[PDB]
């Protein structure tokens, strides 16, 4: 027994009206019979197109980031802007942002808290690098990530929160994450939640796997006890994303 | 016998569908008899609405930022995506970016050269901080900034470039630069261009002034030999912007 899964496509900084339209079409046409929440995270630019086109009842739209408040922040998009715009899902704290864009544990927590406050469903991303991993630091980093988020949230807030564990150590480093290793990272998070906030919250909490997921390994990943679905990059831009939705039965 | 001016509205991180639409109906209503190029820079999110609704022949839409290449940059939007969407103008190197999100002289330079290679018209911001000004480093600060950009550009490239002089201490404070302060800044930049690139280039280059420009102060500003228009934040959210447009011929 598990909560409702989530299949999240993070298109990243990719796209084209043409291509996406076509993908959208494949998605709407998809027959989805179980209870799963599908999420499409498009560039900020694509959002309008995406909303108009996605008619599938099991799909919602999400943005790939935001700043907490409007103002003099050239190039940035804030929560209010998104709220007025009918967007209610957000991806926050993604590792690419953590790495290139100065996103500390603190900035992430703030952004999350800010989002929860304003009503958004948040997919917050945590996860360790090969360095931290190699040095025996997996636990300290992950728990420190989740603890930083957690100091700005009340028990009630949790219902607005989804966690994505990103195996950074396995991303673009040449290493392979196995299902066992994913599961362990997940169980760990769940332990902290269950132990810090509460058992009820813990059982309801969705922990997505945010590593390498393809149509062939997604079911074996799903088959693990603390895997609640996926946050997807590469295969999200492909028809394969369809098998990934299915793998959550 | 000054190059065609520019009145650029920098919305920064602000707006709602309702409010921007109003501004747009306002702009669409306004008649401008002189050779002037007006620019609206809105949030990525609002590019759609802007492009569909803005009908005035003297206006163009702009993006407030971008990165050079598509790929795995969660939260970002590339040049390729913008060009696919109909956007050919872009504001780069804004101080708010340099300050908050770590955009160094090199990073900006890279973004400019790229943008220029993709056929965009680019408004590149340079300017000094309160601190630098008080130290007497102004001339050094600005020449270095411009020089970083010049490095990556070839002579013909310049036909696509616009420089915006935004003294940081003047950004959204009410502390406008006086005409003398803005004209000595603008002349300095242009003497470097003529010296380094060529007199022709300097003669054609547009150098914009930003920093607390408003309906009232715009005229005198513009009256300066080396002032070719403005790049406006706060006042661009108001009907006042209309008066700013009128001050520039
Ligand atoms: O006109 P302000 O004072 O809002 O500042 C404007 C610029 O920083 C944007 O180009």
Q: By C-alpha distance, which of A224, A229, A226 is closest to A210?
A: A229
Classified as helix, coil or strand, B169 is: helix
The span from the CA of B9 to the CA of B172, in Å, is 14
Domains, in order of start, for chain B: 1-249 (3.20.20.70)
The phi-psi region of residue B235 (left if phi > 0; otherwise alpha if psi is between -120 and 50; otherwise beta) is alpha
B175 Cα–ligand 1 center, Å? 11
CB A181 within 8 A of CB A167: yes
| Sign of the four-CA dihedral A124, A130, A132, A137 | positive
Q: Which residues contact A150 (CB under 8 A, 6 or more apart)?
A: A196, A197
* CB B67 within 8 Å of CB A13: yes
For residue A204, count other CB atoms closer than 10 A to its CB: 15
Q: Kindly report the backbone phi and psi dihedral angles of residue B138, in degrees, each rounded to the nearest multiple of 5, phi listed first.
A: -45, -55
Picking from A214, A203, A245, A208, the residue whose alpha carbon sits closest to that of residue A230 is A208
Q: Is B207:B190 a contact under the CB 8 Å cutoff?
A: yes
The 10 Å Cβ neighbour count of residue A43 is 28
Residue from B94, B96, B128, B186 carrying the catalytic annotation: B94
B143 phi/psi in degrees, rounded to 5: -75, -35
Please report which helix (H) or strand (E) contains residue B85, including its range. Answer: none
CA triple B240-B243-B245, angle to 5 deg: 115
Q: Is B166 a catalytic residue?
A: yes
Nearest Cα residue to atom 9 of ligand 1: B233
Mark residue A98 as left, alpha or beta (left: phi above 0; alpha: psi -120 to 50; beta: remaining). Answer: alpha
CB of residue B211 inside a 6 A radius of ligand 1: yes
Does an H or E element contain A37, and which? strand A37-41
Active site residue B94: yes
CA-closest candidate to residue A43, choices A91, A2, A101, A79: A91
Query: Do A157 and A114 touch, CB atoms closer than 8 A?
Result: no
Cα B146 from Cα B205, distance rounded (Å)? 13
Tracing tokens 């090199």 back to the chain, one arrives at B106
Q: Is B118 in the pocket of ligand 1 (CB under 6 A)?
A: no
Task: Identify the residue whose tokens are 């957690």.
Answer: A150
- The number of beta carbons lying within 10 Å of the beta carbon of residue B226 is 20
The 8 Å CB, 24+ separation contacts for A50-56 are A50/A20, A50/A24, A51/A86, A51/A87, A53/A21, A53/A24, A53/A25, A53/A28, A54/A24, A54/A27, A54/A28, A55/A28, A56/A27, A56/A28, A56/A30, A56/A32
Per the listing, tokens 């909560």 go with: A3
And the tokens for B180? 């003398």
A11, A13, A71, A107: best mutation site toward chain B, by most B Cβ within 10 Å? Answer: A13
SS3 B54: coil
Say whether A138 sits in a helix, a strand or coil.
helix
Q: Report residue A119 as tokens.
A: 């009503």
CB A70 within 8 A of CB A62: no
Other beta carbons within 10 angstroms of residue B88's beta carbon come to 18
Nearest Cα to Cα of residue A88 among A125, A60, A65, A66: A60
3-state secondary structure of A154: coil
Q: Cα(B246)–Cα(B218) distance, rounded to whole angstroms?
A: 9
Give alpha helix (H) positions in chain B: 17-29, 47-53, 79-84, 95-100, 105-117, 130-135, 138-152, 179-196, 199-204, 218-222, 241-246
As a whole number of angstroms, the distance between CA B19 and CA B10 comes to 15
Residue B28: CB atoms within 10 A of its CB come to 12
Q: Collapsing DSSP states into helix, strand and coil, what is residue A6?
A: strand
Encoding tokens for residue B101? Answer: 């999100």
User: For residue B150, what are its two tokens?
Assistant: 């010049």
- Residue B25 in tokens: 């109906």
- Elucidation technique: X-ray
Specify the 3-state DSSP secondary structure of A31. Answer: coil
Count chain A–chain B contacts defined by CB atoms under 8 A. 123
Burial class from Cβ neighbours inside 10 Å (0-12, 13-18, 19+) for residue A40 reads buried
> Which residue in the block uniquely carries the two structure tokens 């003294």?
B167
**Closest of B26, B190, B162, B21 to residue B92, by C-alpha:** B162
SS3 A86: coil
Q: How close are the terminal C-alpha atoms of chain B, in Å?
A: 10
Q: Are B92 and B64 in contact (CB under 8 A)?
A: no
């Amino acid at each position: 027994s598990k909560p409702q899964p989530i299949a999240a496509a993070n298109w990243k900084c990719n796209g084209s009206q043409q291509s996406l339209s076509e993908l959208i079409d494949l998605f709407n046409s998809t027959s989805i019979n179980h209870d799963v929440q599908c999420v499409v995270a498009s560039t900020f630019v694509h959002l309008a197109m995406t909303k108009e086109r996605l008619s599938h009842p099991k799909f919602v739209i999400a943005a790939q980031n935001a700043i907490a408040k409007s103002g003099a922040f050239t190039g940035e998009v804030s929560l209010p802007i998104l709220k007025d715009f009918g967007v209610n899902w957000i991806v926050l704290g993604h590792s690419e942002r953590r790495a290139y864009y100065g996103e500390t544990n603190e900035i992430v927590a703030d952004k999350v808290a800010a989002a929860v406050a304003s009503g958004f469903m948040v997919i917050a991303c945590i996860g360790e690098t090969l360095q931290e991993r190699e040095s025996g630091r997996t636990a300290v980093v992950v728990l420190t990530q989740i603890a930083a988020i957690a100091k700005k949230l009340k028990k009630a807030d949790w219902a607005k929160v989804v966690i994505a564990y990103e195996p950074v150590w396995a991303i673009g480093t040449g290493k392979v994450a196995t299902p066992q290793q994913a599961q362990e990272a997940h169980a760990l998070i769940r332990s902290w939640v269950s132990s810090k906030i509460g058992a009820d919250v813990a059982g309801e909490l969705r922990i997505l796997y945010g590593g390498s997921v393809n149509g062939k390994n997604a079911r074996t990943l799903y088959q693990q006890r603390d895997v609640n679905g996926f946050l997807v990059g590469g295969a999200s831009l492909k028809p394969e994303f369809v098998d990934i939705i299915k793998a959550t039965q």
